[PDB]
Amino acid sequence: KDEETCMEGINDFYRTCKLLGINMSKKKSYCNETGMFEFTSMFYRDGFVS
Amino acid sequence: WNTYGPIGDTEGFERVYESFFLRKMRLDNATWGRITFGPV
Amino acid sequence: KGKQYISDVTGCTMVDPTNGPLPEDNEPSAYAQLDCVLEALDRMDEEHPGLFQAASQNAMETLMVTTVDKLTQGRQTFDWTVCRNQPAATALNTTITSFR
Amino acid sequence: ILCMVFSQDTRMFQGVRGEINFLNRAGQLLSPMYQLQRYFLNRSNDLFDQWGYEESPKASELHGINESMNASDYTLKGVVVTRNVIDDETEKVSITKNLSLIKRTGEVIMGANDVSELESQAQLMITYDTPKMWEMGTTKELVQNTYQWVLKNLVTLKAQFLLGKEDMFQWDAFEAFESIIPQKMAGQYSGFARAVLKQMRDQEVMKTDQFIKLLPFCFSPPKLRSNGEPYQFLKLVLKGGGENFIEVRKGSPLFSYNPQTEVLTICGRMMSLKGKIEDEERNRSMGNAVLAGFLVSGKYDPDLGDFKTIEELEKLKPGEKANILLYQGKPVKVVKRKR
Amino acid sequence: MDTFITRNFQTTIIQKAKNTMAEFSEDPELQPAMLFNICVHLEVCYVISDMNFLDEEGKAYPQYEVIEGMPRTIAWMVQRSLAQEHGIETPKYLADLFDYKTKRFIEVGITKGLADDYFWKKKEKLGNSMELMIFSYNQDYSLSNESSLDEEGKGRVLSRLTELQAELSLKNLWQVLIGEEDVEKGIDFKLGQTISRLRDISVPAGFSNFEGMRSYIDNIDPKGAIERNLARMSPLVSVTPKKLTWEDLRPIGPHIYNHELPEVPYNAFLLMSDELGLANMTEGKSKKPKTLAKECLEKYSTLRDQTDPILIMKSEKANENFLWKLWRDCVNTISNEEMSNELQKTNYAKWATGDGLTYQKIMKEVAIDDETMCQEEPKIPNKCRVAAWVQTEMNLLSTLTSKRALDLPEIGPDVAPVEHVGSERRKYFVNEINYCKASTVMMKYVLFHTSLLNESNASMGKYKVIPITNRVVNEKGESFDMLYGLAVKGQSHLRGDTDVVTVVTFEFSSTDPRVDSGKWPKYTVFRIGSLFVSGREKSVYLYCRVNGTNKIQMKWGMEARRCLLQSMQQMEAIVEQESSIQGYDMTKACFKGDRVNSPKTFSIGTQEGKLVKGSFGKALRVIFTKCLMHYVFGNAQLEGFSAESRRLLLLIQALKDRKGPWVFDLEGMYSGIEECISNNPWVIQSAYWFNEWLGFEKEGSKV
Amino acid sequence: VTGDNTKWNECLNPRIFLAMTERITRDSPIWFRDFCSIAPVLFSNKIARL
Amino acid sequence: DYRYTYKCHRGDSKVEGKRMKIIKELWENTKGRDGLLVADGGPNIYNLRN
């Protein structure tokens, strides 16, 4: 609903992956409104891809 | 050999490598259209 | 923070963090509870019914139909007879000769 | 989709998301209707989603269609399929400047933007004569065609050149050839070609090979240096880089001359120039038609020094003699001239 | 074979067999025998399930449910549902057919010999948990239950298989017919004692033997375990989300602004902006480097015959006398007549590069016994402030000179529109960066590294003299053969490719090092003579420097020509983005400009502290220079810094587009970035430029 | 979130992979289950050479 | 790179080499100069469509 609940969900996911042994990188991760992000050296931005 | 070598007979060569010739023929008979960039 | 013991086969120190104490700090942790992993697998299987069974069946069929030569498609392999890094084909040949 | 675009339905207008600033081949903005046509032709899902669906009619032969032309109850509003095929005588129409067909009463029936852009290769080796469209072909073909045109009518070109006017550097063939010349160096090329041709004409060293080689470049307006002296070059480069260059002194893959047999080679094609070559042409070998304001006076003299680059030639002063090299093993000695 | 497959079976059967067997994750072509076997099996089971039917009570007039052919996932879920609904054990192997009457799953098979042994071995494989019927080409049948199939079905199947057997031998296909057991030969897998013990001792804490773990996994229901584990987890395990803001971003590595630290030295292999080529116009023929160097020195004879060196600057450790004598030997070898470029006065070469000062390796036992042999601390890179010469390097390498050094071959005629677009882009790119000094420097670099690599072909235990030459072309068309200096490469007795082979390079230059003393703390420079260009005397210095590089570094230098492709790809990405904003290509419009559009302009740099714009050509030249410098100044620090500045730049972009970025551990990113800013000139200048651009963005975002 | 994982391969445990393999192949022939399990157990006893 | 490695420069080029003399002779004697392979000093015709 609001970014506060989104970040609560992100925190819950972080704790869950910690329980499974997966350690998320706080020093190399960031969050932003959906539409622009990266995935395996492939930047996606509102349709454009590089 | 490519200059003064014996001249052999190449009849029926297209048949042996028919797939490549078919690819080339398909390419030659192409009808290119427009080019459209990303949606954004 | 896991369980430290002595292997009774190789006689080497062994560390087992699984089902260990949960972290109290943001530092990296290797203590993965078995129950959480099992529940996650259960959720995945329920969401994708008939997925694990089909994948396992396909893998076992491929293994049945495969051949030893498949092992030769790989990067440098550690040959134990000489204890070095050798090409996959040479390592496989040396292992086969030793087995013979 | 074209029916949507032509119907001017408000939904089609609302179904545009991105910019529609499309350009045509001539570089002129398309008409708004054709802009929407092109945008929706490239973008079909958006309009189909925006239009809205409805229930198909209950008639036996009438059924709907989805975005991917799949029969379904949900059909584009006002669109239906029908198995009752509808059946598919000549007149004269006038034309205007913009290649737009206008009927007798004046309505436009076919515009210049309705031409499908589907490029293809003709199944038959079509031929054209006009030089205005040679630019469509590759650079080597353009060079071959322009040099063939120059050679075939060489008598008329020589006759007009001997008159000394300027109407012979504006032939349609030269305008077609100018396209493959880089814009930045076109002025210098033309200035140098005009200067060398004028120098050749003044003092009779008329060489057929050099004349043919350097005639096409003379079109573009001259671009001289601040000193008022024409530029100097060793080889004139054309578009496409690499092989596409004409050597001013020895010969290039695009242009070569064999005086022993008197054979002209253009882009790998060989021709005979018998009857267009003077006996004394061979004796005046090359040195009088390679630089502007320079003429031959002697032979290789190691004492004067090694060969001088164009940089030193351009800064030279009148009455001073220098040495140049045509090709490997054929050096020559030249002298600057005021004329 | 495949012709028989497509002729003897309906297209549906062939397609079903093909798509069911393609799930094996292997090539379906080179091995079609199993395709024939699977097609025959599919036909057999289809026939078996087409004659008998049931009713509300079980009238025989369906009874057989087909599981094979359908997708493995759907088949498995259907089988599990049937087993659950009928309250019977689920076979571990996917049954090919199920019976409604017997309430049991069944399997079918096809063989070539007697079916009794096949049935018995299948029973041993599956035990007694599944029924089976088996038929053989040689008229043999086997049924676990005699009340399974009727005479009609058995007769039809027998006739079909007999016909197939008869037809196979007509086209010489029965010979190459593989059996059926081969695909399932391995069904026995017994673990040894040692492996069983290793498995038992490799279970998570809380289990004694692997049997307990297996039972726990196969029995326990762990639903709700994640919530229970998360409830008691400490609150301290939190990502600590933090909304990012413009003021949060701060300059990276402020220490580079500390005037106390020394200036960054010039550690590039070859001089880039200070080069000086002894031009020697040539017709265009290809000649050996030794002859080219000899001719170039002959033209500038005064420099060659210089014997008294006027030392101008000296390195901290290098000896000027040794370097000068080595240079004299190199020029003597170049000016001689022997074809080989091999040094004959090895004295000064050996004693100048410190090749005799290497430690001698002794047996490990002595070192263990010895007490004075101790490991040495790592010489961590020093910390240096901003170097002013990197800005000048970037400025000058992006300028347009009077000469070009690129001559690429031709390509076939362009027909497709994409080819035309690519050709136009290539034309614009080359026209823009043909004469750029960066291109000439790149060509010199790649050519020198190629020559260095080639010289290591057979000469490894000998000194080799190599001139730093280049082939260049000017606008007028006349081509020159430039000589930028010499370099003598030493020996590498070890055959390893990652082993440093010391090479000392003497490059000419026209810049007095005293102007920027901090730019050359590692160079030994003399003064050889003076050239005349426009009647004016300009001095010539000889920068002599020792260096060490390995064969892999030679390969890297050779590949350094990839900067051209890199820059072209960057420009093409820019153009593709511009065109993606629209729906049509934006190449000519963004380069030259159309009626609708205007020539795109890019913010290039700063002039007196104010922003300055420029044409797309200048942006392309700057991109090419940046790529070339990145390749030349490349070390682990540079790649790490780039990898982390990627994340920082992406966050800045998200901020620009009003996407409301959030950062969890910002200081972690900043530390990761600053961990790499130690002594690389390129890294330090990149940090400086990043700080400047970040300040500009901050001050420009308030509008 | 463009998340990244620190020490990904220095935290995953071969025992957890063994558990995953056992759970996945819960309905499969015992011999194939053992064959799949032989790899995780071998990794759980890996010895590194320096 | 291919031409440098195989010493198969264009037949109409002015380069000199052991193989280049025969290449030049073949180029002089050949009529279909567009059909000669690149390895024989002919013109390259490769592009995206082919």
Short mmCIF file of C-alpha atoms in Angstrom, two decimals, chain E residues 126-435:
data_model
loop_
_atom_site.label_atom_id
_atom_site.label_comp_id
_atom_site.label_asym_id
_atom_site.label_seq_id
_atom_site.Cartn_x
_atom_site.Cartn_y
_atom_site.Cartn_z
CA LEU E 126 9.78 -52.79 -9.59
CA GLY E 127 9.19 -55.70 -7.20
CA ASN E 128 5.49 -56.55 -7.00
CA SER E 129 4.06 -53.01 -6.79
CA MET E 130 3.09 -52.85 -10.48
CA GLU E 131 1.54 -55.23 -12.99
CA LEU E 132 2.93 -55.65 -16.49
CA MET E 133 2.19 -57.02 -19.94
CA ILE E 134 5.04 -57.62 -22.38
CA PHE E 135 5.10 -58.55 -26.07
CA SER E 136 8.05 -59.53 -28.24
CA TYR E 137 8.65 -59.27 -31.98
CA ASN E 138 9.21 -63.05 -32.11
CA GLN E 139 5.61 -63.86 -31.14
CA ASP E 140 5.95 -64.09 -27.36
CA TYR E 141 3.60 -62.65 -24.74
CA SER E 142 3.69 -62.41 -20.95
CA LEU E 143 0.99 -61.19 -18.56
CA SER E 144 1.15 -60.95 -14.78
CA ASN E 145 -2.63 -61.43 -14.66
CA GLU E 146 -4.38 -63.52 -17.31
CA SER E 147 -7.58 -61.46 -16.87
CA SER E 148 -5.90 -58.25 -18.09
CA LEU E 149 -6.14 -58.32 -21.90
CA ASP E 150 -8.54 -60.04 -24.28
CA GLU E 151 -7.73 -62.04 -27.40
CA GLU E 152 -8.54 -59.19 -29.80
CA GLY E 153 -6.07 -56.73 -28.29
CA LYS E 154 -3.26 -59.26 -28.02
CA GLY E 155 -3.83 -60.41 -31.59
CA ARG E 156 -3.86 -56.89 -33.01
CA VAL E 157 -0.70 -55.92 -31.11
CA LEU E 158 1.02 -59.13 -32.21
CA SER E 159 0.07 -58.53 -35.85
CA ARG E 160 1.32 -54.93 -35.72
CA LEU E 161 4.66 -55.83 -34.13
CA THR E 162 5.17 -58.79 -36.49
CA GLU E 163 4.49 -56.53 -39.47
CA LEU E 164 6.99 -53.98 -38.14
CA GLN E 165 9.60 -56.71 -37.64
CA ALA E 166 9.07 -58.02 -41.18
CA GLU E 167 9.24 -54.53 -42.69
CA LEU E 168 12.38 -53.53 -40.76
CA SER E 169 14.57 -56.13 -42.48
CA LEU E 170 13.43 -54.98 -45.93
CA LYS E 171 15.40 -51.70 -45.75
CA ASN E 172 18.35 -52.99 -43.69
CA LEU E 173 16.99 -51.46 -40.48
CA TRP E 174 16.58 -54.57 -38.30
CA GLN E 175 20.38 -54.86 -38.11
CA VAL E 176 20.74 -51.44 -36.47
CA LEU E 177 17.71 -51.97 -34.19
CA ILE E 178 18.85 -51.51 -30.59
CA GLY E 179 17.19 -53.45 -27.79
CA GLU E 180 15.11 -52.02 -24.94
CA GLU E 181 17.01 -52.91 -21.75
CA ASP E 182 20.04 -50.79 -22.72
CA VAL E 183 18.36 -47.53 -21.68
CA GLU E 184 17.75 -49.02 -18.21
CA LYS E 185 20.84 -51.17 -17.68
CA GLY E 186 21.81 -49.32 -14.50
CA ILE E 187 19.21 -49.98 -11.81
CA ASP E 188 21.54 -51.40 -9.14
CA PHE E 189 23.37 -48.80 -7.04
CA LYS E 190 24.68 -50.02 -3.68
CA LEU E 191 26.71 -47.67 -1.49
CA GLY E 192 29.88 -48.88 0.17
CA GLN E 193 30.72 -48.69 3.85
CA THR E 194 32.97 -45.64 3.56
CA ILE E 195 30.50 -43.63 1.50
CA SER E 196 27.68 -44.62 3.86
CA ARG E 197 29.72 -43.37 6.82
CA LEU E 198 30.49 -40.12 5.01
CA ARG E 199 26.78 -39.65 4.30
CA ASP E 200 25.87 -40.40 7.92
CA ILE E 201 28.37 -37.85 9.27
CA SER E 202 27.12 -35.21 6.80
CA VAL E 203 23.65 -34.52 8.24
CA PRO E 204 22.46 -31.33 9.97
CA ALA E 205 22.81 -31.15 13.73
CA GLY E 206 20.02 -33.06 15.48
CA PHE E 207 20.25 -36.34 13.55
CA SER E 208 22.37 -39.40 14.32
CA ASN E 209 22.16 -41.32 11.03
CA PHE E 210 21.02 -40.39 7.54
CA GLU E 211 18.04 -42.73 7.92
CA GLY E 212 16.67 -40.36 10.56
CA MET E 213 17.15 -37.38 8.25
CA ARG E 214 15.44 -39.19 5.37
CA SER E 215 12.47 -40.17 7.54
CA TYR E 216 12.22 -36.64 8.96
CA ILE E 217 12.20 -35.13 5.47
CA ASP E 218 9.71 -37.66 4.09
CA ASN E 219 7.32 -37.53 7.08
CA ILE E 220 7.33 -34.26 9.01
CA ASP E 221 5.04 -31.41 7.91
CA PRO E 222 7.05 -28.18 8.32
CA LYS E 223 4.19 -25.79 7.51
CA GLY E 224 4.41 -22.63 9.59
CA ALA E 225 8.06 -23.15 10.51
CA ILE E 226 9.20 -19.92 8.85
CA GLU E 227 6.86 -17.80 10.97
CA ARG E 228 7.92 -19.57 14.17
CA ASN E 229 11.61 -19.07 13.39
CA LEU E 230 11.10 -15.42 12.44
CA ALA E 231 9.05 -14.62 15.55
CA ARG E 232 11.91 -15.39 17.95
CA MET E 233 14.65 -13.92 15.75
CA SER E 234 16.23 -10.85 17.30
CA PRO E 235 14.98 -7.47 16.02
CA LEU E 236 18.62 -6.49 15.44
CA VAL E 237 18.55 -8.45 12.15
CA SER E 238 17.12 -5.61 10.07
CA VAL E 239 18.21 -4.09 6.78
CA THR E 240 17.59 -0.66 8.32
CA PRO E 241 15.86 0.93 5.30
CA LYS E 242 16.71 4.59 4.80
CA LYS E 243 15.17 6.88 2.19
CA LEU E 244 17.89 8.50 0.12
CA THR E 245 18.10 12.25 -0.43
CA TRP E 246 20.30 14.62 -2.40
CA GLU E 247 22.00 15.94 0.74
CA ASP E 248 22.82 12.36 1.80
CA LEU E 249 25.27 11.97 -1.08
CA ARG E 250 28.71 13.38 -0.28
CA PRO E 251 32.03 13.59 -2.14
CA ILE E 252 33.88 10.27 -2.32
CA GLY E 253 37.44 10.00 -1.06
CA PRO E 254 38.06 13.56 0.14
CA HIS E 255 41.66 12.60 0.96
CA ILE E 256 42.54 13.09 -2.72
CA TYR E 257 42.12 16.80 -1.98
CA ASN E 258 44.77 16.56 0.76
CA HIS E 259 47.73 18.60 -0.47
CA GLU E 260 50.07 16.75 1.91
CA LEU E 261 49.94 13.58 -0.17
CA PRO E 262 52.20 13.47 -3.24
CA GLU E 263 51.06 13.86 -6.82
CA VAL E 264 50.20 10.70 -8.72
CA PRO E 265 53.13 9.60 -10.93
CA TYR E 266 52.93 8.72 -14.62
CA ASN E 267 52.90 4.91 -14.73
CA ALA E 268 51.63 4.40 -18.29
CA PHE E 269 53.81 2.15 -20.43
CA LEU E 270 54.24 4.62 -23.31
CA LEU E 271 54.05 8.39 -23.47
CA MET E 272 50.63 9.39 -24.81
CA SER E 273 50.40 13.19 -24.98
CA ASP E 274 54.15 13.90 -24.94
CA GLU E 275 55.10 11.57 -27.80
CA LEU E 276 57.39 12.80 -30.57
CA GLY E 277 57.51 10.88 -33.83
CA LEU E 278 60.45 11.39 -36.18
CA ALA E 279 58.39 11.67 -39.35
CA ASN E 280 59.80 10.08 -42.51
CA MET E 281 57.53 10.24 -45.55
CA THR E 282 57.36 6.94 -47.43
CA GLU E 283 55.60 5.66 -50.53
CA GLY E 284 53.63 3.12 -48.50
CA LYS E 285 55.63 -0.10 -48.73
CA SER E 286 55.93 -2.42 -45.74
CA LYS E 287 59.43 -2.76 -44.29
CA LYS E 288 60.97 -4.43 -41.27
CA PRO E 289 61.02 -2.28 -38.11
CA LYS E 290 64.83 -2.31 -37.98
CA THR E 291 65.15 -0.79 -41.44
CA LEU E 292 62.47 1.80 -40.67
CA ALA E 293 64.26 2.83 -37.48
CA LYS E 294 67.58 2.97 -39.31
CA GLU E 295 66.14 5.25 -42.00
CA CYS E 296 64.39 7.45 -39.43
CA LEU E 297 67.61 7.91 -37.47
CA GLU E 298 69.50 8.58 -40.71
CA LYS E 299 67.07 11.39 -41.54
CA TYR E 300 67.61 12.85 -38.06
CA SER E 301 71.31 12.02 -38.05
CA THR E 302 72.16 14.66 -35.43
CA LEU E 303 70.18 12.85 -32.73
CA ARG E 304 71.69 9.48 -33.68
CA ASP E 305 75.27 10.78 -33.46
CA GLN E 306 74.73 12.34 -30.02
CA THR E 307 77.33 10.96 -27.61
CA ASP E 308 77.46 13.53 -24.78
CA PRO E 309 74.20 13.39 -22.77
CA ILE E 310 72.91 16.51 -21.01
CA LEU E 311 71.16 14.88 -18.07
CA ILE E 312 68.05 16.82 -17.04
CA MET E 313 66.30 14.57 -14.50
CA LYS E 314 67.07 11.30 -12.74
CA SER E 315 65.03 8.57 -11.09
CA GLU E 316 65.41 7.78 -7.41
CA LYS E 317 67.12 4.40 -7.96
CA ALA E 318 67.99 4.11 -11.65
CA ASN E 319 71.54 4.90 -12.78
CA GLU E 320 71.77 7.47 -15.57
CA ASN E 321 75.11 6.19 -16.89
CA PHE E 322 73.88 2.63 -17.37
CA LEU E 323 70.71 3.75 -19.14
CA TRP E 324 72.64 6.08 -21.43
CA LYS E 325 75.16 3.40 -22.36
CA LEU E 326 72.31 0.97 -23.05
CA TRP E 327 70.64 3.55 -25.31
CA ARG E 328 73.94 4.08 -27.12
CA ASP E 329 74.22 0.32 -27.65
CA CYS E 330 70.64 0.20 -28.93
CA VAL E 331 71.24 2.97 -31.47
CA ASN E 332 74.51 1.33 -32.54
CA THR E 333 72.66 -1.94 -33.16
CA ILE E 334 69.92 -0.12 -35.07
CA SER E 335 72.45 1.69 -37.26
CA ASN E 336 74.49 -1.44 -38.10
CA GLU E 337 74.00 -3.69 -41.15
CA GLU E 338 73.16 -7.13 -39.73
CA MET E 339 69.56 -8.20 -40.31
CA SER E 340 69.05 -9.31 -36.70
CA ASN E 341 67.98 -6.72 -34.11
CA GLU E 342 69.93 -8.50 -31.36
CA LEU E 343 72.15 -6.63 -28.93
CA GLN E 344 75.78 -7.75 -28.93
CA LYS E 345 77.03 -5.57 -26.03
CA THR E 346 75.07 -7.35 -23.31
CA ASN E 347 77.17 -5.74 -20.55
CA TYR E 348 75.23 -2.52 -20.00
CA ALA E 349 71.90 -4.15 -20.83
CA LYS E 350 72.48 -6.78 -18.14
CA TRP E 351 73.74 -4.31 -15.53
CA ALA E 352 71.17 -1.55 -16.23
CA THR E 353 67.85 -3.36 -15.74
CA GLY E 354 68.94 -4.88 -12.42
CA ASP E 355 68.86 -8.36 -13.95
CA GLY E 356 71.87 -9.48 -11.89
CA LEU E 357 70.45 -8.35 -8.55
CA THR E 358 67.78 -11.06 -8.38
CA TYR E 359 67.95 -13.23 -5.27
CA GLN E 360 69.20 -16.80 -5.58
CA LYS E 361 66.78 -19.58 -4.66
CA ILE E 362 68.02 -22.11 -2.11
CA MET E 363 66.58 -25.39 -0.87
CA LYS E 364 63.61 -25.03 1.47
CA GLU E 365 65.37 -27.05 4.18
CA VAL E 366 68.08 -24.41 4.63
CA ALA E 367 65.44 -21.68 4.85
CA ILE E 368 63.56 -23.63 7.52
CA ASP E 369 66.80 -24.10 9.46
CA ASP E 370 67.87 -20.49 8.89
CA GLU E 371 66.54 -17.87 11.30
CA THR E 372 67.17 -14.71 9.23
CA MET E 373 64.87 -15.77 6.37
CA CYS E 374 61.49 -14.17 7.11
CA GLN E 375 58.53 -13.25 4.93
CA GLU E 376 58.49 -9.63 3.80
CA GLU E 377 55.59 -7.28 4.40
CA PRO E 378 53.40 -6.35 1.40
CA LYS E 379 54.22 -2.98 -0.17
CA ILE E 380 50.68 -1.64 -0.07
CA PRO E 381 50.12 1.11 -2.67
CA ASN E 382 50.80 4.60 -1.38
CA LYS E 383 48.13 7.29 -1.18
CA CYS E 384 48.33 10.20 -3.61
CA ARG E 385 46.37 13.40 -4.20
CA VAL E 386 44.89 14.71 -7.46
CA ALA E 387 47.39 14.78 -10.33
CA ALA E 388 46.99 17.76 -12.65
CA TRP E 389 48.52 15.96 -15.65
CA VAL E 390 45.61 13.53 -16.09
CA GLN E 391 43.33 16.44 -16.98
CA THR E 392 45.84 17.59 -19.61
CA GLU E 393 46.11 14.02 -20.91
CA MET E 394 42.33 13.80 -21.33
CA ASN E 395 42.16 17.26 -22.90
CA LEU E 396 44.91 16.64 -25.45
CA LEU E 397 44.08 13.04 -26.39
CA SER E 398 40.57 14.21 -27.36
CA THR E 399 41.84 16.83 -29.82
CA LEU E 400 41.88 16.45 -33.60
CA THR E 401 45.40 16.30 -35.04
CA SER E 402 46.54 16.49 -38.67
CA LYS E 403 47.17 12.74 -39.06
CA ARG E 404 45.15 9.53 -38.85
CA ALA E 405 46.33 5.96 -38.31
CA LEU E 406 43.20 3.87 -39.03
CA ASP E 407 42.75 1.95 -42.29
CA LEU E 408 40.14 -0.79 -41.97
CA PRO E 409 39.12 -3.15 -44.79
CA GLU E 410 35.87 -2.98 -46.74
CA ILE E 411 32.49 -4.63 -46.21
CA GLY E 412 29.90 -5.99 -48.60
CA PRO E 413 27.19 -3.76 -50.04
CA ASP E 414 24.43 -2.80 -47.62
CA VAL E 415 20.87 -3.79 -48.53
CA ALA E 416 18.80 -4.24 -45.38
CA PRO E 417 17.74 -1.05 -43.55
CA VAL E 418 19.63 -2.18 -40.44
CA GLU E 419 22.79 -2.43 -42.53
CA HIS E 420 22.23 1.10 -43.83
CA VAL E 421 21.77 2.41 -40.28
CA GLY E 422 24.92 0.64 -39.13
CA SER E 423 26.90 1.95 -42.09
CA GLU E 424 25.75 5.50 -41.41
CA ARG E 425 26.73 5.17 -37.75
CA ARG E 426 30.15 3.80 -38.74
CA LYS E 427 30.65 6.62 -41.24
CA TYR E 428 29.86 9.28 -38.64
CA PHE E 429 32.00 7.60 -35.97
CA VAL E 430 35.09 7.18 -38.14
CA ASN E 431 34.75 10.67 -39.62
CA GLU E 432 34.58 12.07 -36.09
CA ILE E 433 37.45 10.09 -34.55
CA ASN E 434 39.60 9.35 -37.60
CA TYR E 435 42.21 12.01 -36.79
#
